[PDB]
């Protein structure tokens, strides 16, 4: 499996890379740039990021995949467990939704579900 993780915080990128082939990038705009060049099995993204957020990226990715781009499942991570935010993401195209800080065992099992 080939992974692509995106988070604005420095501490979050490092802990996820150690427990998991992984590429890490900062913003939501950059993960859209990274996906345009390379192909990935799954994308892990933080919901609340400055500038462009997880949902804005999700909507933009949805139109890209509908335009012809190869499908990649997206799992979202967030501190907010609010039911209104979960519904909006899966209606934008999200396949999984996990709370922060995420338990390692449940992340790996949900990644195994996608394949």
């Amino acid at each position: 499996m080939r992974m692509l993780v995106a988070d604005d915080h420095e501490a979050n990128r490092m802990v996820l890379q150690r427990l998991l082939k992984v590429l890490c990038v900062n913003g939501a705009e950059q993960v859209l740039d990274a996906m345009a060049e390379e192909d990935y099995d799954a994308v892990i993204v933080d919901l609340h990021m400055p500038g462009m957020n997880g949902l804005d990226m999700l909507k933009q990715l949805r139109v890209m995949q509908a335009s012809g781009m190869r499908y990649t499942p997206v799992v979202v991570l967030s501190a907010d467990v609010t039911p209104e935010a979960i519904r909006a993401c899966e209606q934008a195209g999200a396949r999984a939704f996990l709370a922060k800080p995420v338990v390692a065992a449940k992340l790996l099992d949900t990644l195994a579900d996608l394949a």
Binding site: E29, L32, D33, A36, D56, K59, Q60, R62, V63, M64, A66, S67, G68, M69, Q91, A92
Partner: protein, 262 residues
């Protein structure tokens, strides 16, 4: 040559297949070919006095239509060429308005959507009187994602089906919707299984072919009541072009990424 035209003169059914020589978007060539054929077919139908002809808008691509020529947009915006962008926008309006008023020959316009329809593509489907969609097809208006809005009649056509307020939301949210969802929202008229769209169109044609006087009369009633005036749509694209000209580098880069994907 961007179109594949199938004509059935003895039955007065006419099929327009987009993207015959294949980005599956409304390029200048595709727009000119559509308007050129609309004008041609409409004049032939009028002089022959054909009552309630049927025109079908379909696609030869695996998508229906992905909307405006974004690569052209990026270029004209960066060059500051308002005149050419307005020209393009006005020609897109003429194309979709012609479907809305039945080519000036009181035709029944049917959109056959067997692949994804985005932006201008969705607007073109909405310009037809009947929308047939196949299961798994996605439609939406993603132009807000690069800080623009749908100016090819999205608002005008949706207001025929839903409230002005809900139409506004849909235009500004930038979500995609499945055929089943759009059916529930009243934005699509029929959803059929994959590869059954043609048969569904044939049933619609056969249904309205038996009531040609009723259809033609209803178009006259539309003309004098709820029909969207061409002028209204032209003024909407004026706003569209002025907005597009003010777009920044972040929007232009978003458009560039979509161009590469599309």
């Amino acid at each position: 040559s961007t179109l594949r035209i199938i004509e059935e003169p003895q039955r007065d059914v006419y099929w327009i297949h987009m993207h015959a020589d294949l980005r599956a978007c409304f390029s200048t060539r595709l727009v000119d070919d559509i308007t050129g054929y609309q004008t041609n077919l409409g004049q032939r139908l009028n002089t022959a006095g054909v009552l309630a002809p049927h025109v079908v808008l379909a696609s030869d691509s695996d998508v229906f239509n992905l909307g405006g020529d974004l690569a052209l947009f990026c270029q004209l915006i960066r060059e500051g060429d308002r005149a050419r962008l307005l020209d393009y926008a006005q020609r897109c309006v003429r194309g979709v308005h012609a479907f809305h008023v039945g080519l000036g020959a009181r035709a029944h316009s049917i959109a056959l959507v067997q692949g994804n329809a985005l932006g201008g593509g969705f607007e073109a489907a909405l310009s037809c009187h009947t929308i047939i969609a196949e299961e798994g097809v996605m439609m939406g208006l993603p132009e807000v994602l690069f800080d623009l809005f749908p100016g090819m009649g999205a608002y005008s056509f949706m207001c025929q089906r839903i409230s002005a307020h809900l139409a506004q939301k849909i235009m500004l949210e930038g979500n995609l919707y499945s055929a089943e969802q759009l059916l529930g929202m009243g934005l699509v008229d029929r959803v059929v299984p994959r590869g059954q769209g043609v048969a569904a169109v044939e049933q619609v044609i056969r249904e309205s072919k038996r009531t040609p006087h009723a259809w033609a009369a209803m178009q006259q009633v539309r003309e004098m009541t709820t029909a969207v005036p061409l002028e209204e749509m032209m003024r909407i694209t004026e706003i569209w072009v002025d907005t597009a000209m003010q777009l920044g580098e972040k929007s232009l880069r978003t458009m560039d990424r979509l161009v590469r994907a599309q």
